[PDB]
Amino acid sequence: HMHKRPKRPRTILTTQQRRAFKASFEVSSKPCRKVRETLAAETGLSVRVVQVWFQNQRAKMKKLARR
DNA sequence: CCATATTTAATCTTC
DNA sequence: GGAAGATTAAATATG
Known about the structure:
Elements: H1 15-27, H2 33-43, H3 47-64
The structure holds a DNA duplex.
PDB class: dna binding protein/dna
Keywords: protein-dsDNA complex, DNA binding protein, DNA BINDING PROTEIN-DNA complex
Assembly: trimeric
């Protein structure tokens, strides 16, 4: 019988964090879990934040792909 | 197959 | 106002 809990604060990426994600995206848009773990450790972000960033990046590039 | 994980598509939300 | 981070259920992928 759980109450409705609020959302986590929206992540505000630093420039170094975003550059780390973009550089990995360049070699694969779908990092395996080991890579997501490595990226989480290098950025200090949670593995979920890492996964979601790639999710959202893929959605963005998919729309652009048809111009 | 079957349980679990990941991804997709769509959207809600906020910086 | 607009890009994008966070969430959701469904679909697809994986072991």
